[PDB]
Amino acid sequence: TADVQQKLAELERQSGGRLGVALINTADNSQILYRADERFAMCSTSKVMAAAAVLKKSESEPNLLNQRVEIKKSDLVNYNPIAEKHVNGTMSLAELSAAALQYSDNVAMNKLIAHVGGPASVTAFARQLGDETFRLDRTEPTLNTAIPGDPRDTTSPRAMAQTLRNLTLGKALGDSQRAQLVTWMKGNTTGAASIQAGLPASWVVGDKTGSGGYGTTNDIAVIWPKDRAPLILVTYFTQPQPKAESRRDVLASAAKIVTDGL
Ligand SMILES: *[B@@-]1(O)O[C@H](CNS(=O)(=O)c2ccc(Cl)cc2)c2ccccc21
Ligand SMILES: [Cl-]
Ligand code: NA
Ligand code: NA
Ligand code: NA
């Protein structure tokens, strides 16, 4: 629809920032795209790719998710809601994956990153899946600086939507691992104000939010509408001012605009 395009342009204009949207509708294999090939800083939406990398590694290492990881005071960063409770103990890689995905715990992300070999290994995993756009450059918390013009720790909406489709609805991961990823994302606790706030209450969503510098406010989701084929939706947003506040309402509005009529 050209109208959906115009509506997203009007949202972007009023918001004052830069908006990126990619909707994949698996009912008819259609897409709605808005700046879908521009790069945006992923912030915490990158935790999906890190958890997925660990899950993939687990296909050939059955004990892997039960492996224990020490949590030290020296591991704490700037957002540790789960890990701060396990300092001087261990958490399993399953627990760290869930903490990263469902509470956006930054220590959990750093452990997933470390375990698979660092940011270039998470990036190599993306490449293995056919995503040649995703780049994870840094660890937490610096991967969230979201400086305009900086390509580090960025991807495009089109690439992340296609990759999220492969991960949650396709066959990137084994059946057990795919189910686990989707179960984790459906249990996310951080997304109610984002894409979910622009969709009917009856719809089931598995999402991962992100936020960071320059008021960057992001969400990526797999969506099961009532009695319809699933959707993938990426909404990326960032602003001109370094200390701009988050605008989750912009993502809810984009979600509402692109699902109107379904
Ligand atoms: B990353 O983008 O995710 C975490 C948490 N972000 S948040 O904005 O603090 C948030 C959003 C919604 C809820 Cl319900 C809770 C918390 C994070 C923290 C620091 C840097 C990057 C990320
Ligand atoms: Cl409703
Ligand atoms: Na991507
Ligand atoms: Na959401
Ligand atoms: Na977030």
Question: How does this structure look, described?
Answer:
With 262 residues, the protein is of the alpha+beta class. It contains eight helices and nine strands. It has one domain: DD-peptidase/beta-lactamase superfamily (Beta-lactamase, 3-Layer(aba) Sandwich), CATH 3.40.710. It has helices at 2-15, 47-58, 93-102, 106-116, 119-128, 157-168, 175-186, 248-259, and strands at residues 18-25, 30-34, 40-41, 68-70, 90-92, 154-155, 204-212, 216-224, 231-238. The strands form three sheets. The protein has a five-stranded antiparallel β-sheet, sandwiched between helices. Strands 3-6 form a two-stranded antiparallel ribbon. A two-stranded antiparallel sheet has the order 4-5. It is globular. Bound molecules: the ligand *[B@@-]1(O)O[C@H](CNS(=O)(=O)c2ccc(Cl)cc2)c2ccccc21, chloride ion and sodium ion (3 copies). One sodium ion is lined by residues 44, 104, 190, 209-211. The site of one sodium ion (NA) has 7 residues, from helix 6.
Which ligands does the model contain, each kind named once?
Answer: the ligand *[B@@-]1(O)O[C@H](CNS(=O)(=O)c2ccc(Cl)cc2)c2ccccc21, chloride ion, sodium ion
Number of helices: 8
Radius of gyration: 17 Å
Secondary structure tally: strands: 9
What is the correct CATH architecture? 3-Layer(aba) Sandwich
Shape: globular
Q: If strands are numbered along the chain, what order do they take across the biggest sheet?
A: 2-1-9-8-7
Helix and strand content put the structural class at: alpha+beta
CATH superfamily: DD-peptidase/beta-lactamase superfamily
What gap, in angstroms, lies between the N and C termini?
Answer: 13 Å
Domain Beta-lactamase class A catalytic: 21-235
EC number: 3.5.2.6
GO molecular function, one term: beta-lactamase activity
Enzyme class: hydrolase
